[PDB]
């Protein structure tokens, strides 16, 4: 109260000083009980690859990825590479290919090669890529007879749209069918390197999910109910109590949403029940004092909470179950304004001295000592 | 096998308050949800046929069939219907459904008697044989075919009706529950059916949906439809 009012003397009255909040006690995480590991040897190391204009998908699905082994062979999009290791999803889409040194930045969510004309990487890309430079190992002139580059067509394609037709296309003033002319060209030419193919490994991560099959290397813990806990359900972090919902979820539904843009309920990844996301109890703190000219004894009102959701046992609150750094008080009384700690309730009615709420007022009277 | 048939002029009918499906997988209950999505416009002109004409697929098609028994046994989806691009075929063969994405090569008038739908099924890339989508002129079947980038969403409903047989697509409301979510990466611009018949087209509109205590839609209002609805 003194630091809020910026004074060493406090007048008589009730003062709103801080907010009562409850710490999470257990820090729990819930992942599906999987014991598999990702075979990254097939991911990083291979000898034959598909083309720059028609690449394929070696999808590593249902395999628990670890990203500390990334540098055994970078650019990263969507999620920064320090925290791909805690995300959870269902499938990993592999989108690997080969490139040229003048094409190292043209297959991207942003920046301009044959991939924009025959098979394209999306701009809304939520995966992380690996930039491997393989001239110093695979030393040769021609990469492959199936690796070819071109300059333009008459129209661009969508991401993952495949059209590898070998025909002259027209951006000029006349149609051409095997005819050279103004913007009638067939620029599809094969690679010829000088001192050597280069290779990129892409792992696209999906959205709009089923219940998740793949997680990070974090070890899941036990489920704690009816207490304020710090939870993590398949990447969904938060703090609150986990009670049973009694909600009619369909089996393909994994999350329930309230009025606001947040999650109200979540399906447990292991035991498949439905748990409410209810944040643990809080309220304003009101400090009732008769004035530092009169006394230093104060009473504390925790607004809008029960007397069971508040620190009552002041001798065991050095273990910090609450965001309140201290805990004082002797007498505990329940008021519709909140749980009042520090004032002894009497059955005698007096004129209102310090208002609290719902017909209850506080005063500093003689009972014989002052309290 | 190609077989010769008789061409007829089309008819038109009213849509009433019919053609509302579940837009998302999130289970909302006891609310009023404002959504901006593909829907059939209310009180629109639904094209009514009795033949099997080749119709466009203008970004989602509401389909309905009123019949006594199993007559219309499936659908055909694609851009071109020769052996040049891939296409989708759904056949409700008596005790099963066969769903194929292949290259295909159809005849001019595909129909079910025997099987004369196509001639070749080279390079089959998706197949799904399961419980037939068709269920139970008393029978009414509703479907919504929505081709989003990556997915082909079919929504369905089956209803025993007792109305007048011509010009009487019945008034009332029935939400169309999701039936199947095909993971097909093909372009779809045109569709055909296999042998009443109703085809309406979806448009991006704004709807107000009423979610009850059981999570089932029981009322839908279109602001665009009327100022009071707005």
């Amino acid at each position, epitope marked *: 109260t003194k630091c809020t009012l910026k004074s060493f003397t406090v007048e008589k009255g009730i003062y709103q000083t801080s907010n009562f909040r409850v710490q999470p006690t257990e820090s729990i995480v819930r992942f599906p*009980n999987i014991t598999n590991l990702c075979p990254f040897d097939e991911v990083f190391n291979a000898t034959r690859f598909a083309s720059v204009y028609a690449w394929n998908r070696k999808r590593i*699905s*249902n395999c628990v990825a670890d990203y500390s082994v990334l540098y055994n062979l970078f650019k990263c999009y969507g999620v920064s590479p320090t925290k791909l290791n805690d995300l959870c999803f*269902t*499938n990993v889409y592999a989108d690997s290919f080969v490139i040229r040194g003048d094409e190292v930045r043209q297959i991207a969510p942003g920046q301009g090669n044959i991939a924009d004309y025959n098979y394209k990487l999306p701009d809304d890309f939520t995966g992380c890529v690996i930039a491997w430079n393989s001239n110093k190992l695979d030393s040769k002139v021609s990469g492959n007879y199936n690796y070819l580059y071109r300059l333009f067509r008459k129209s661009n394609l969508k991401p993952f749209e495949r059209d590898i037709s070998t025909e002259i296309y027209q951006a000029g003033n006349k149609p051409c069918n095997g005819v050279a002319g103004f913007n009638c060209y067939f620029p599809l030419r094969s690679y010829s390197f000088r001192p050597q193919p280069y290779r990129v490994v892409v792992l696209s991560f999906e959205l709009l999910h*089923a*219940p998740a*099959t793949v997680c990070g290397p974090k070890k899941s813990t036990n489920l704690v109910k009816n207490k304020c806990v710090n939870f993590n359900f398949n990447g969904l972090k938060g703090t609150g109590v986990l009670t049973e919902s009694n909600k*009619k*979820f*369909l*089996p*393909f539904q994994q999350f329930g949403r309230d009025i606001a843009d947040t999650t109200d309920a979540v399906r447990d990844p*292991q*035991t*498949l*029940e439905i748990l409410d996301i209810t944040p643990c109890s809080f309220g304003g703190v009101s400090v009732i004092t008769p004035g530092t000219n009169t006394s230093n004894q104060v009473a504390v009102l925790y607004q809008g909470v029960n007397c069971t959701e508040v620190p009552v046992a002041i001798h065991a609150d050095q273990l910090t179950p609450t965001w309140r750094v201290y805990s004082t008080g002797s007498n505990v009384f329940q008021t519709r304004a909140g749980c009042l700690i520090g004032a002894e309730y009497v059955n005698n009615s007096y004129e209102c001295d310090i208002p609290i709420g719902a017909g209850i007022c506080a005063s500093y009277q003689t009972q014989a000592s002052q309290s | 096998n190609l077989t010769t048939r008789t061409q007829l002029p089309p008819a038109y009918t009213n849509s009433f308050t019919r053609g509302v499906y579940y837009p998302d997988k999130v289970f909302r209950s006891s609310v009023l949800h404002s959504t901006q999505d593909l829907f059939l416009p209310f009180f629109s002109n639904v094209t009514w046929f009795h033949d099997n004409p080749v119709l466009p697929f203008n970004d989602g098609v509401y389909f309905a069939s009123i019949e006594k028994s199993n007559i219309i046994r499936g659908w055909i989806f694609g851009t071109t219907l020769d052996s040049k691009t891939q296409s989708l075929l759904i056949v409700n063969n008596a*005790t099963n459904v066969v769903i194929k994405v292949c290259e295909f090569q159809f005849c001019n008038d595909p129909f079910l008697d025997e099987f004369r739908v196509y001639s070749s099924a080279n390079n*089959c*890339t*998706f*197949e*799904y*044989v*399961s*419980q*037939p989508f068709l*269920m*139970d002129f008393k029978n009414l079947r509703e479907f919504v075919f929505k081709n989003i980038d990556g997915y082909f969403k079919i929504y369905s409903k*089956h209803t025993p009706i007792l109305v007048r047989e011509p010009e009487d697509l019945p008034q009332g409301f029935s939400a169309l529950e*999701p*039936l*199947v*979510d*095909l*993971p*097909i990466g093909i372009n779809i611009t045109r569709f055909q059916t296999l042998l009443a018949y109703y085809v309406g087209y979806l448009q991006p509109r704004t709807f107000l949906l009423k979610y009850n205590e059981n999570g089932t839609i029981t009322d839908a209002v279109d602001c665009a439809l009327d100022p009071l609805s707005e």
Partner: antibody
Amino acid sequence: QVQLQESGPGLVKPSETLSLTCTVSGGSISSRSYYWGWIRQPPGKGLEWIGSIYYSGSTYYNPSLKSRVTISVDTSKNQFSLKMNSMTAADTAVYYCARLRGDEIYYESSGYYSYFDYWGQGTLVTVSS
Amino acid sequence: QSALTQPPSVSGAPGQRVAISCTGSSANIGTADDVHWYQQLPRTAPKLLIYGNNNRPSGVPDRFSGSQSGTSASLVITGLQPEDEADYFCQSYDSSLSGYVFGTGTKVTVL
């Protein structure tokens, strides 16, 4: 010619380790790309479902078997394994391997129904002893 | 979730119509979708006998079928055979839990 062979021991004490293996006899039908399940039937009681697996993942479990024990499919060896670790006293029963329905190719679909069509012979396990 | 009410037994006099039924809630059978009946001879695997509320698989004869309508599903068996003395089970797909609920069974006895 669709037959389902089943294997697994039949007598354990409570808190013991056991596993049931289900193999395909060799028919291409009910071999690789199908939905699968296990059915438990107590002696003197009716059928009741315990286990089901859909494509690679997407496992649905009985409320009795929700976190009780897991299930696995080795697709290449046509092996359908249901672990049986530390069973409670009510699991003395005959167990059946069963294919649902539905061939599917190359993708991961989303169907809202279920089946059981072909059934194994059934293996008896005793745990109340 | 299940609510599956099924009679325990019914008279199985041969050459005579036997109608059996199971009724659940309005979430699995009342959706008019995915209810199966299984036939189980004693010491024999319970094969899939009829599916799709009336749809008959390969090998199952005629005059012996299903008549589901709404919340109640029912089999009609006209002309009971001596090989049809078995136990008949239901199975329905619910949307709230998908617990794949089964019936208690109707053990037919011939006389």
